[PDB]
Amino acid sequence: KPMVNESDGVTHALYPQEARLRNLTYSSGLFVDVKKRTYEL
């Protein structure tokens, strides 16, 4: 969901009215389920 990581580090909710005044990026994070392997062949 759209969020802002502030300068201290709080990553909370977001609304575009505040995003228009604080000059930010109405943006959401993306995450990837990574899988690690090792072949020994």
Q: Does 3 bind another protein (CB under 8 A)?
A: yes
In the chain, alpha helices (H)? 16-21
- Token reading at 36: 């690690």
Token pair, residue 16, equals 């575009």
Q: Is 23 in the site for another protein (CB under 8 A)?
A: no
Task: Give which of 7, 5, 4, 6 is closest to 15, Cα–Cα.
Answer: 4
Nearest approach, Cβ of 7 to another protein (angstroms)?
5
Q: How far is the CB of 22 from another protein (least distance, A)?
A: 8
Rule CB under 8 A: which residues touch another protein? 1, 3, 5, 7-13, 18, 21-22, 25, 27, 29-31, 34, 36, 38
